[PDB]
Structures are given as C-alpha cells and as structure tokens.
Amino acid sequence: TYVSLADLERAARDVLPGEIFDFLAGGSGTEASLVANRTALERVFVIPRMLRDLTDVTTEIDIFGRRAALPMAVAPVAYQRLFHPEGELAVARAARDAGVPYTICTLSSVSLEEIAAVGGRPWFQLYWLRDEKRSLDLVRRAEDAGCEAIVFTVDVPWMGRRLRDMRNGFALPEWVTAANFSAVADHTAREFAPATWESVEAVRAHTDLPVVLKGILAVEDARRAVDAGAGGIVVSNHGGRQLDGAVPGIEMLGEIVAAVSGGCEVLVDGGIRSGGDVLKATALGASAVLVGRPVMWALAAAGQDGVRQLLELLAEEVRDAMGLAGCESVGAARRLNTKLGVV
Amino acid sequence: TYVSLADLERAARDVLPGEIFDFLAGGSGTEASLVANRTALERVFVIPRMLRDLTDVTTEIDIFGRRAALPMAVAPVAYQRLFHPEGELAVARAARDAGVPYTICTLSSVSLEEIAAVGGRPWFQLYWLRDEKRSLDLVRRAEDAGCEAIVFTVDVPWMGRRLRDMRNGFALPEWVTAANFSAVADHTAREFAPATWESVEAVRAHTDLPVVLKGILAVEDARRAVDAGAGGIVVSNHGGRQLDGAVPGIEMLGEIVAAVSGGCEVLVDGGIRSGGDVLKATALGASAVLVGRPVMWALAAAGQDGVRQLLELLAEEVRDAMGLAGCESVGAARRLNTKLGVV
Amino acid sequence: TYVSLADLERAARDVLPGEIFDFLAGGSGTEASLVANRTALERVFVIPRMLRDLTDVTTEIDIFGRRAALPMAVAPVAYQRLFHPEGELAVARAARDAGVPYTICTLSSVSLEEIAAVGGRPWFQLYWLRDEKRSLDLVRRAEDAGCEAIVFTVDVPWMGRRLRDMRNGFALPEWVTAANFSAVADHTAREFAPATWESVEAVRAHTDLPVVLKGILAVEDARRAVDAGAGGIVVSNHGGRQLDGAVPGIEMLGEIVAAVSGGCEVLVDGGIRSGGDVLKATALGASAVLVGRPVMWALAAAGQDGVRQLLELLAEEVRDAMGLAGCESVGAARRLNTKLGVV
Amino acid sequence: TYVSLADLERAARDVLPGEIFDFLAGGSGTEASLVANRTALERVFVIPRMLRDLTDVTTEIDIFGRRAALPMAVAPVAYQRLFHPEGELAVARAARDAGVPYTICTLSSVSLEEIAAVGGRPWFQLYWLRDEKRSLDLVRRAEDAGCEAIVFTVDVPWMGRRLRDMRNGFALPEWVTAANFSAVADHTAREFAPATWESVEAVRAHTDLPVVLKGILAVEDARRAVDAGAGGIVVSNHGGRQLDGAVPGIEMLGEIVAAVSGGCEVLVDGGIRSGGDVLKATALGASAVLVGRPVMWALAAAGQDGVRQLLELLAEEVRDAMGLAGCESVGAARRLNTKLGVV
Ligand SMILES: Cc1cc2nc3c(=O)[nH]c(=O)nc-3n(C[C@H](O)[C@H](O)[C@H](O)COP(=O)(O)O)c2cc1C
Ligand SMILES: Cc1cc2nc3c(=O)[nH]c(=O)nc-3n(C[C@H](O)[C@H](O)[C@H](O)COP(=O)(O)O)c2cc1C
Ligand SMILES: Cc1cc2nc3c(=O)[nH]c(=O)nc-3n(C[C@H](O)[C@H](O)[C@H](O)COP(=O)(O)O)c2cc1C
Ligand SMILES: Cc1cc2nc3c(=O)[nH]c(=O)nc-3n(C[C@H](O)[C@H](O)[C@H](O)COP(=O)(O)O)c2cc1C
C-alpha cells in the first residue's frame, strides 16, 4: 500500500544491493544536474482554475497514432534484470495493462522481440551503433516486432562519468547481458559511435515510424529536430547522468514548446515523481512525460505487481491534480498558467 | 500567557491526539503548497511610513454590511469538536466577543442554527451538495438563521490527497458528526458534487446575501467572479490541502486586486500567523484575511478562553503593526508599499 | 586581541546576564527584520577598482560641520550602564579618542551633560516627550551642552513587541535609570507621544543644529525629510526592534540616495559588522553608517578599552577594504558599483 | 586513483599541518568571496548541443603565442615548498608534461631561473616592488629565462586580512624562503608598493612579452587594460583572499568579454574544480581558466605524480564535458549558451 512514489524508493533501497541502487540513483560528476531536475520542478507552481465542468475528466492522450491512458510513458532504462529477475517483461506487462507506452531499450536484458510480444504497442529506444548498417538493423527489427516509435537517444556520444559506479567498481553481473546483441562506461565508449544529424536522416529514411529525439535541450536543436522530420523530441538532461551542469529539461521546456509551435510532440523527463509533477510539465507545454527511476523502484520492490501499483498511483494522482486544477482534459492542462516561486 | 501564535501551536500539539493534530496541520501530497504559504509571506517586507497622526488608530473595517473589529475573520474549518468538546460554540462565542466574523461550516459538528444563535453576525460556508435543491436548502437555512454572507468554497470538486490522513488511517470518532445533515476523503467524493459557474448563479439567485467565492487563484477567475455578481472572493489554495503545487494566494493577491479594481472584496488566507502578516496582506491589497489553523490551536489548548486570548493577541499585534507602519486605518495600510526580499 | 567584530559578540555573551544579552540582541516579533538586516548585506557584492593611486588613503569625512575619522558614528543605544558600570562615559571616551561621533540618548543612564563633558563633539538622540515644551527642553539642554546634531528618532511612536523581553520578564535593575529625567515597553507607551511632521518642524525651529531623522524607509518620507529642512536621515528599521517585517534600510538606501539627490546626508544602519560592510553601505550611496550592538559587545567585554579596540579594528578594516577596492577617499567609495549575488 | 578534484582536497587535508592547510584554503574576512566563487559557478547551467561531429574533439588552445593542451594554466601560488619539499619544481614538471602553462611566482620558494629550466614555456607573475627599477629587473630576469608572459597581479596593493592566518599566528618555516630575493601580511605591507596604471605602462615598455593583468573585476578596468596594451586579463577576486565582499570573477566575466570584444584574452579564476566548471567558464566567454588550490592539494598529496594525476583527470573531464555538450573545439564551447538556475 504505497501512497506516494517516495514510498517505492524506500522499498527499493531496502532490497537492492548497494551498487545496483547506486547504478540506478546516480548521476554524473557532482550530481548537480540530477539534483537540479528536482529543484527545478519544486520551484514551479500551478495557477489552478475553478468551477469548470468535470463530469468526464479524462487523462488520455493521442500520441504517435495511439491512445495512451495517461500523458506518460515508461522511460528507456537499460538492463532491467539488474532490478528484478523478470526485468523488462514485468515492466512491459504492467505498462500494457495500464495503457501506458513502454520504451524497449537497445541495451535491454531481454530481447526486443520477447518484450514486444507482451503487447501494449511499445516504443523502441535506439543507441547509434558502430555503423549505419547495424543501427538500421535494430530499427528494422523493432519495426518488424510492432514497435510504434523510434526514440533515438541523442545525448550519449559516450556515457557520462558516473562517480558512484567508478567508486563501487560497478560491472554487470554475469547473468545480465545486452540481449539484443565503470565497466558499463568502458563498454559504451568501445561499442557505440557518436550520432549526428546525418544519423537522424539515415533513421528517418529507414522507417515510416515516428522518430523521437531524446536529449534535446537547446532551442535551435528543437527547431532543427522539426526541420529534420522528427515526430517528437524529449527535452531531457538524461536524468543528470550525462553532462554534469546540463540545464534541466523542465527549465527549457516552455521556450522549446514556443519555438516548435506544434511542429512535433514535445515530451520532457527528469525528476517526475507525482501526478502533480505531470501537471506542472503539462502546464509548461509538454505533450507527455517520461518516468524512469520510479518505475525501477517499483520493479525492484515488487516486480510486475509493484509496477502496476505505481502506475495505478500515478494515474490517480494525475486525475486528482487535473480535476483540482479545473482540467477535464490534458489539452486544458496545457493551457494552465504557472508561477515560479522560491523553495 | 501566549505572546505569539506559535505559543498556541506548541500547546495544541501537547494536548491533541497525533492523528487529529495531523488532520489539522497537514496538506495534500508533499505539502509543497502548505510550506509555500509560509515562505511566500516571509519574503514580503513592508515599507513603513513615519510621522503620521496616530491619535485614533482603528483596526476596524466595514465588510458585507457589518463593522468588524479587525480585518480578519475565522476561516471555515470542518468538525471543530475534533479539537475541543465545545467545538464550534466555543469558537463562535469568542469570535462574537472579539467582534470578528465567524464562518459556520457546511460540515460543522454543531448545527448551523445552534452556532448562529450564539450571535455575532456569522457567515456560512457552502459545499455544493448532490443537487441544486439541497444545496440551496442549506443556503436558505443559513439565511433564515441570520448568517450575513455565503462563503461558497470553489476549490473542492473533491477532497485533496491527505497523505498524513491516509497513513494514519484517519476517520472521525463516533462522537463527531456532520450536524447539518482517508475516510473523510471517501465521504466527500460520495456526498458532494463539483461546483461550476452555473452553481454560483443558482446560489446568487437564491439569496440576497453577498456570495463570496473561496479558493480563487487565477486572475480571470477573479474577474469572472465579479462578473458573476460575487460580493467577494478569498484568494486561497485552501491551506495547501487541495492541489499540491497550487500557488499561494499571497503570491496572486496583488495581481488579483488590480484586476478586480474594486469590483468586490478581496480576502486572502493561508499562513497568516501574526498581526504583521495581516499588515503584509493588507499592504498587498487584501480587504481582510481569514485565519484557520491558529484558531483551532487556541480551541484545542484552552477552549473558548484560548480563542479569546488568540484574538486579543492578534488584535494587539495588528494595532502594533499598523501604528509602527504609520497607518491610522486599514485603508492607509492598503496604500503601503512592499518589497520582496530573500530569506 | 580581537580580529573581527564577531570575536566581541562571543566575549559579551560570556559576561552578560542572559536577559541583558537578550535585551541587546533581540528584535520584535519573529525577528524577521533583525535577520534580514544581515541577509541583505550579505547579498551585496562590491565591484572593486584596481591600479588607482593609494599614496594617501583617508577614511575621513566631513559631516554636520565636523571632520570624523571614519564614515561611522556610534548609534543611540539606551541604558548603557546595563552593559558596564561606566556605561555611556566609557563609550563616549573611546569614541572621542577614535575621532568617531557618539550619539547621546534621551534614555541615557548617565546625564547628557556629563557625557557631553567628555568632549568629542557628540550628537543627541531625541525621543518625542509628552509635550512640545519638554521635548524642546531636552533639545535646548543638548545644544547648550555642545551637542552638534539632533538625531530625532521617528520610528518609535511606541516601542515594538520584544518577545525575548516579554518571555524573560525583563525590567531595568534598580541601579540603572533614565538619568536625563516588558517593563521598558510599558514605560515608553506611558511617557512618550508619537512624533509627527509637526514635531519635526517644532524641533527645526527650536535649534540651529542639524536635525537628522532616524528611521526613514519610504522614499517619499526621505524626500519629505529634505523638504522639512532635515540635515540628514538615517535609513533604518531600528535594528529589527520596531516593525517586524520592515524592510532593511540597506535595501532602500540606493533608491533613497537617488531621490534625495544630495539634499541631505543619508546614513544607514542595521547589521554593519565589518569595514567591508561599511564599504558596501558607502558603495550604495551612504554618507556614513551607525553601529549599535557591536559597540555594546565591546563595552560589555572590556569597558572603555574594549570600545577602543573595536574602533581601532573597524578603522583598520575600513582602510583595508577601501584600498583593496581602489578608493583613496570615501567619496571614491561612493562611486563604486555593486552587484547582488546569491548566498 | 582520484576520480574528482575533491578526492585531492581530502588527501591534502590528511597530510598537511593545520596552519598550512589554512594558509592554502583560507580567504580574507568572513570568507564571503571565497564561498561566493563556488556558489556562483554552481548557479550556472550549460545548454548543451547535440548531434555535432565529434570525430576529432580537441581541448587545445593557442594563447600568448603557444599551443596549450587545455584551456587552463596553473595559477600563481606563492611558496610551494610549504606543501611538498620539491615545491615549484614538482608542479612545473607535471605542468610541462601535461602541456599546461605554469605561472612562476615573484614569491616562489625556488628561484625563477631554476623553475624555468624545467622547460614547458612558463609564465611569470609579478608583484610590484619598492621601485620601478627593481620590479623591472624581475621582469627582465623572467624574460631572459624564457618566460612567455608577464602576469602582473593588480589586486594586491597590500595583502588582505587573512583571519585564519592571524588566529593561527602563521609564519613561514625557516626552510621556506622567497628565493627570487599574519607574518606574511606584515612582510608584504613593507616590501611591496601599490601598483598603478603607470606601473603597467612601465612594464609594457620594458618587455615585448604579453602583459596580463590579474585581478580585474570592473568592466571599465577591463576596457582600460585593453587600452593600456595588455595582452590579457584574469577576471578574478584572488580566490577570495583580498577584498572580502568582492564579486566573483565568474559573475563579471560575460559583461567583461562583451566589453573587451576580442581586444585581449580574457581568463577567469576562482573555484574551478572540474572539467565541467571549465566548460562553464568557456561558455561564459573565457579564453582559459587558472586553477590554484587544487594543484596544491595534488602537490601536497603526492608530489609531482599527484599533480600529473590531477592534470590527467582535468584533461579527461574537459574532453568529456566538451563532447557531451557538442563541442569539437574550445571555440565551439565559447558559443554555448548558459542559464542561471537556483541551487
Ligand atoms: C539506470 C538508468 C538507465 C538508463 N538507460 C537509458 C538508456 O539506455 N537510454 C536512454 O535513452 N536513457 C536511459 N536512461 C535515462 C532515462 O530514460 C531518463 O531520461 C532519466 O532516468 C530521467 O528520468 P527520471 O528522473 O524519471 O529517472 C537511464 C536512466 C537510468 C536511471
Ligand atoms: C482542519 C481543516 C479543515 C478545513 N475545512 C474547511 C471547510 O470545510 N471549508 C473550507 O472552505 N475550507 C476549509 N479549510 C480551509 C481553511 O478555511 C483555510 O483556507 C486554510 O486552513 C488556510 O488557512 P490557515 O493557514 O490559516 O489554516 C480547512 C482547513 C483545515 C486546516
Ligand atoms: C539595546 C538597544 C537600544 C537601543 N536604543 C535606541 C534608542 O534609545 N534610540 C534610537 O534611536 N535607537 C535605539 N536603538 C537602535 C540603534 O540605534 C540602531 O538603529 C540599531 O541597533 C541597528 O544597528 P545594529 O545592527 O548595528 O545594532 C537601540 C538598539 C539596541 C540594540
Ligand atoms: C596559498 C595561495 C597563494 C597565492 N599566491 C598568489 C600570488 O603570489 N600571486 C597571485 O597573483 N595570486 C596568488 N594566489 C591567487 C591564485 O592565483 C588564484 O587567483 C586563486 O587561488 C583563485 O583560484 P582557486 O580557487 O583555483 O584557488 C594565491 C592563492 C593561494 C590559495
């Protein structure tokens, strides 16, 4: 019986080995960007509206051609068998049952085809490989398996400096592997090549699926993403795991939404920890959010049923926040105003 | 012998059962809006005037056709028998004796007619019921009993998520009931319907009493309230108990006062804890404030006499603050300027 | 051997009875304005100049017709025998020897004529008495005794609410009296009348000495002071002892200096604790500062010799700060720019 | 195996005598400017760019006619034998091997000619001596020994008030001397004269080497430096060791870069503690940074090899930060935008 997402973090801390909790919790460098993701959300206040018709409040959205139950997807998180033996299958099953898109990772610890077979109209996250030809094979596999969007991660030319992982001497256990094919940082520097705008065009030409660029923070990169034919972007500093000192996505979101001016979907992530945070993101103009660490807390704590409980809690919090703010729909929530405060 | 409102909180904490203290103290979600009500007041500084005539300083105001001794009313707080056996009668008697309006609640634990019989020209707070017909019956009862204003609460389409109450498994004791007719959250979701602008018009047509909309935060909702024929509004986030992340009323007050441009009374609440806080609210343009939790601290600590002592202390602090700031009247206090500082 | 003013506070805390330390240290209400005086100074940063001629750095100023060794006077502090048996005589002797003006108080615990006989061209602080005639007698006594300015305190229509003094049940010991004629708050409410602009004019007509209005915070009150014929003002919230929530003087100083546009001397006080703080005040446009509590710390710690050591330390810190900032004179320091930072 | 610069501070604290750690760590006065150097950097966030070509990322710059491996030089720090017996020779050897300029101090504890003989194309820091003739002798010695720039320190007309050193009664041990010729503060007040713009011109006429003015904070002093023929400036508050309350250099840097408009190199120092901090400085417009205390931490911890490890770590962090931010060159990093956040 969890009444907040924070209840799940406490539960996950109890069960996970310290080094795996640190792999999950940590960020790069001094963790300034990790902390700032939370600080930035905490400074945003919503100006709610009153006395509106709430006889049919709905939290649903249409995105990338599918109805989703909430303005929320499960973020790509590598190697989910680190957290629970059922790994990605547990999370994908719960997401399917909740009507929430699940992002299958390039570095999934269960093969993308197995996770796709769970159903639920999943997305696929791409890391750019050694060459155009192989990268494009994963994309084609994902499309053949029924994935509905390609989430191209664009903020990882290589992995950031994870000092918790370095200090812990973290490496994957023998029983966790990259099923589609700091020791994890060394492996990435060797196996993956930096993506460029040319890589984006190669992907866009290889699939009719919407291509979503994850890790955009500069306004002109958002504009360029639209010009490049992206169907969406995720405004994100990769949970503070990449450039330490990168601005939080939530701080760039409003300016990016204005610049994009409806030319693509604009998602955000980093520190979303409640339905109220989802409302803040929506009020700043997001189409939807991604949620990362909390989904893994729930997986660690109680497997598939833990993820189900998390998604049920988030669904209740989103409905609650929307109605209290006078919003019968997510579109109405996007028209809310906000104020910055001091915390 | 209390010299500050904070002395009363300490006293109430000692006497009340933990779960009832939590029902009183708590807010929704992470309590961000609860804390922000205090932070927001603490950032406001007054620019006092000197060398003005203070030979007849008066703290009185005229509001809703009655002279009040202070620019202050007792906020609606449900179920006052939770805090002291005399409940609403103790508070209403002290308010009457102090010349302060008392707001009788829809969810009062003593009937509205009994509390009105105490005297003191009380107000009545309305929650919108299952249908127009019954809602309007409470309004007519209140008017027949001599209530002088209808304070229509507009920020409770349903009750917020009170995590202290959920964790405590809080429910009303058998000896406390809704005398006019989280377990308290479940009861509200079943018994009350979301109010709309149509509900406001139904009330306005049913009574000649001034209708005051409590829980307005958006500037256009304040304008619309005036257009709808409201006699007042209370700029309020419901003490941080409704939308977690709602802006504090004190942060919207100046902009609302400007937009309303004298078309209705503009009250504020949330975190008023001293006569100096009353002065800040007045300087930002409020007609008057409501005070909630501190009145219940005083009731818990010492019953009717506790509430009397609280109101005497607040009266002294308001007079002190006004005179130190060069204000012989509340109208002069409204013309004070303020500065935001850092705390 | 004290190397900072903070060394003196530690020393005074050791020696003074708790209730007398609290009478000295405390402020009104929640002490928000007391704390804000420090916060406000800490947020100000100086932009120093380099490579200027420092062959004859001088900290002297001319003010109210006298050369002073520093841009600094000892603030009026009532009842100095509370802190040391020699009281005002010890402080006045040290101030004289340092070339710093000393402000003799209406509520001095040694008669104004005795303190004036020490020499050093002192100032006299006036509280407005029961009637024009008696007030004007103190003014005439002060002038006859050789005081060179009248510092009319304008922010005390009555004494603020000193909760430390109330809680301690503070009263003057039998051996400390008002030699020119909370128990101290009760005594003031009875003996003194609120001053007005008419009182200022009565004083201005009664003496050719410069009249300095102490406790101005509003820009139009500063302008009006010039129009009224004041020779100076002290921009001040009375060390956070009067209106709790009054803006710090340091936050109003720049705007007041601009509005006054050389029409009178503009002093500031509240929280000056180093030569660097004096430099900040000067850079914001002050003619000079007053220093209150630290002078009493020094008096408590070591009598006349303690005050001498404090003034020597402040003199060294002022010279140091000025030269490091490229200022050969106080006038050059007034032309420094500042930046607000975060602390 | 250090993974951050903070690992080195912990190591240095363990080994150094307390008073020498304090000589190194401390600042003047209350250490407000020392702390502000860190606060100021922590508030700056970078807006990284994505999807750029990173096939040949280079951290090199050209400055004062030499290629440097990083946009970074070792700051002038007096008396390095305080920290390790090899002192300046250890640091200079490591800097040479890393391709980083080393600044030889006027108050070096090994003679400038010995340190220059190490190689690595060093710079020389000048304090203005008793007269033009002797000052100019050090300059000529430095030039004859192969130093490539003169870093004229302009913020030390005398040494600041180092309260840690005063409290510790710090003095140099007998075995540490000024090899080119608070007890250290007393020695400086006697031996050195305040520099002026005339001193700058005397130096500029005495050498063809670029003259770099270290300790500029005012925009017009930066402009004047260009007009005076300076080849560079270091925007700096001397690590918070000079004027307590001086603005951090990082807070003035952008405005200075705009005013200078390419007329000289603009360096910054104060609190640079990671490659991410170097990126922030570059994004604000710096040509390069200086690093002071961390180099001494490394020297204290492990001598020459410690400094080598520090420089290798900084080089890795700079490359990491640049690439994550989409910058193949330091010039691209200078074109990054930043956002101020709250911490
Ligand atoms: C343990 C972990 C692994 C991750 N792996 C990936 C990945 O393979 N691909 C990717 O695009 N993002 C990855 N992310 C980033 C997340 O998708 C997301 O951007 C980030 O966690 C911020 O959201 P949060 O604060 O909700 O966790 C990972 C995050 C974590 C914590
Ligand atoms: C225990 C409790 C019960 C309340 N019940 C009601 C209510 O029935 N109707 C209403 O409009 N507001 C209600 N309120 C909100 C108050 O009227 C007021 O808006 C809020 O407490 C903020 O003021 P404060 O910080 O002075 O407590 C309640 C508040 C508390 C703490
Ligand atoms: C114990 C005490 C007594 C004071 N008495 C007087 C007074 O009689 N008249 C007056 O104008 N100000 C009085 N002041 C105010 C000071 O003159 C000054 O405005 C204030 O202390 C702020 O300066 P500080 O922070 O340097 O103490 C008093 C202050 C203190 C602490
Ligand atoms: C122990 C110590 C000695 C220093 N000596 C000198 C000096 O002789 N000349 C100079 O221009 N700066 C000197 N500095 C200032 C540094 O060059 C640099 O401006 C400052 O330390 C800020 O950088 P940091 O935060 O990286 O230490 C000294 C700094 C320290 C800590």
Numbering used by the authors:
A (entry chain A), B (entry chain A), C (entry chain A), D (entry chain A): 2 to 182, 196 to 357
What do the paper's sentences say?
p-Hydroxymandelate oxidase (Hmo) is a flavin mononucleotide (FMN)-dependent enzyme that oxidizes mandelate to benzoylformate. Its Y128F single mutant unexpectedly shows a new reactivity and is able to oxidize mandelate to benzoate via benzoylformate, a four-electron oxidation reaction that is typically catalysed by a monooxygenase. In this report, both biochemical and structural measures were exploited in an attempt to address how a single O atom dictates the oxidation level in the reactions catalyzed by wild-type Hmo and its Y128F mutant. The present structural and biochemical elucidation nonetheless strengthens the idea that the FMN cofactor is versatile and cooperates with the active-site residues and substrates in dictating the oxidation cascade.
The redox-active center C4α=N5 of isoalloxazine is surrounded by a constellation of active-site residues [Val78 and Ala79 at the bottom and Tyr(Phe)128 and His252 at the top], where it is accessible only from the upper front side. The reaction center is sealed to form a narrow and low-dielectric milieu suitable for hydride transfer/electron tunneling when a substrate and redox-active center C4α=N5 approach each other. 2 N5 atom of FMNox acts as a nucleophile, but this scenario likewise contradicts the current understanding: FMNox is a strong electrophile that accepts electrons. Nevertheless, an extra chunk of electron density at the top of N5 of FMNox was observed in unbiased difference electron-density maps, and this electron density was denser in the Y128F mutant than in the wild type [Figs. 2(c) and 2(d)]. On the basis of this model, the p-OH group is in a position to protonate C4α-OO−-FMNred to form C4α-OOH-FMNred, thereby neutralizing or facilitating the discharge of H2O2 from C4α-OOH.
